[PDB]
Amino acid sequence: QCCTSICSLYQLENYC
Amino acid sequence: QCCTSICSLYQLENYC
Amino acid sequence: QCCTSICSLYQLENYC
Amino acid sequence: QCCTSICSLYQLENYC
Amino acid sequence: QCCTSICSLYQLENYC
Amino acid sequence: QCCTSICSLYQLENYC
Amino acid sequence: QCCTSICSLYQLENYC
Amino acid sequence: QCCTSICSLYQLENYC
Amino acid sequence: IVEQCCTSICSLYQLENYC
Amino acid sequence: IVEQCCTSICSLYQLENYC
Amino acid sequence: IVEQCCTSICSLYQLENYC
Amino acid sequence: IVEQCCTSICSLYQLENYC
Amino acid sequence: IVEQCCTSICSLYQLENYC
Amino acid sequence: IVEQCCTSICSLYQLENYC
Amino acid sequence: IVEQCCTSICSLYQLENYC
Amino acid sequence: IVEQCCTSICSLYQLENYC
Amino acid sequence: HLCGSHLVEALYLVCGERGFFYT
Amino acid sequence: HLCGSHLVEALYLVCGERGFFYT
Amino acid sequence: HLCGSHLVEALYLVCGERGFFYT
Amino acid sequence: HLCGSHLVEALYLVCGERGFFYT
Amino acid sequence: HLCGSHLVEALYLVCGERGFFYT
Amino acid sequence: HLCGSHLVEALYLVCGERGFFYT
Amino acid sequence: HLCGSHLVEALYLVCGERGFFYT
Amino acid sequence: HLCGSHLVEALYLVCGERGFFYT
Amino acid sequence: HLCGSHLVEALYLVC
Amino acid sequence: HLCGSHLVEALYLVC
Amino acid sequence: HLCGSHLVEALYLVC
Amino acid sequence: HLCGSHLVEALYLVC
Amino acid sequence: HLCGSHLVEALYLVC
Amino acid sequence: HLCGSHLVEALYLVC
Amino acid sequence: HLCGSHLVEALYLVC
Amino acid sequence: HLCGSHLVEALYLVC
């Protein structure tokens, strides 16, 4: 239950 | 239950 | 139950 | 029950 | 029950 | 019960 | 019961 | 339950 | 597409001898 | 696409001898 | 794409002898 | 993309002899 | 991308002899 | 990207002899 | 990126002889 | 990046003979 | 009354040109 | 009343040009 | 009443040009 | 009433140009 | 009432140009 | 009432140009 | 009421240009 | 009421230009 | 396997 | 395996 | 394996 | 393995 | 392994 | 291993 | 290992 | 190990 941002996430990543 | 952003997600990633 | 963004998702990823 | 965005999704990904 | 966006989906992906 | 977008879908994908 | 978009679908995919 | 920032996340990282 | 072709010409367009 | 082709020309467009 | 091609020309466009 | 190609030309565009 | 190519030209664009 | 290429030209653009 | 290449040209752009 | 390359040119841009 | 007027939709499934073309 | 007027949607699934082209 | 008027959506799945092109 | 008017969305999945191009 | 009007979203998944280009 | 009007979001996943370019 | 109006977000995941460029 | 109006966020994950550039 | 051994392909253009 | 041993491909253009 | 041993590819352009 | 031993590729351009 | 031994690649451009 | 021994690559440009 | 012994690469540009 | 012994690379530019 968040506003204008991420919440309850686990993993986030770009890669190169 | 979020507004204008991600929530309850698990994984997010670009790749290259 | 979200507005103008993602919610209840699990996986999201581009690839190349 | 979302507006102008994704919800209840599981997987989303481009590929190349 | 969503407006002008996806909901209750499971999988979505381009490929190449 | 959605307007001007997809709902209750399961799978969607281009391919090539 | 949707307007000007898909609903209650299961599978959709181009191919080539 | 956060506003305009990340919460409940576990991992985040760019890479190159 | 699979141009799995060996030991001869394949997919040529214009082989020419102009003179 | 798989141009798995050996020991000959493959996917040529214009081989020419102009003179 | 896999241009797995050996011991011959592959994917050429314009081989020419102009003179 | 895999240009796994040995002992011949591969992916050439314009080989020419202008004179 | 893998230009795993030995003992020949690979990925050339314009080889020319202008004269 | 892997230009794992030995004993020949690889990734050239313009080899030319202008004269 | 891995330009693991020996005993030939690799990644050249403009080799030229202008005269 | 690994320009692990010996006994030939690698990553050149403009080799030229202007005259 | 469920939906209004002047509604527009356009779904394209286009696996375009494939093969060899020498135009 | 569920949705209004002048609604627009456009979904493109375009695996465009593939193969060899010598235009 | 669920949603308003003049709504717009556009989803693109575009695996664009692939292969060899000599324009 | 759930959402308002003039809503806009645009999702792009674009694996653009690949291969060899000699324009 | 859940959300207002004039909402905008735009998600891009763009694996852009790859390969060899000789423009 | 959950969220207001004129909300904007834009998520970019851009693995841009890769390979060899000779513009 | 949870959040207000005119909210903006922008998340960029940009693995930009890679490879060889000879502009 | 949880959060106010005119909120802004911007998260950048930018592994910028890599490789060889001869502009 | 795609092709055998001792393969030859001779091409002659003359003017 | 794609091609064998002792392969030859001779091309001659003349003017 | 992609190609064998003692492979030859001779190309001659003349004017 | 990609190519064998004693490989030759001779190219001649003349004007 | 990618290439063998005693490999030759001779290129001649003349004007 | 990528290449063998006694490799030669001679290139001649003339005008 | 990447390359062998007694490798030669001669390049000649003339005008 | 990257390269062997008795390696030569001669480059000549003339005008």
Swiss-Prot record, chains Q, R, S, T, U, V, W, X:
Its gene name is: INS
Q: What protein am I looking at?
A: Insulin B chain
Q: Which stretch of the full sequence is covered here? A: 29 to 51 of 110
> What domain of life does the native source organism fall in?
Eukaryota
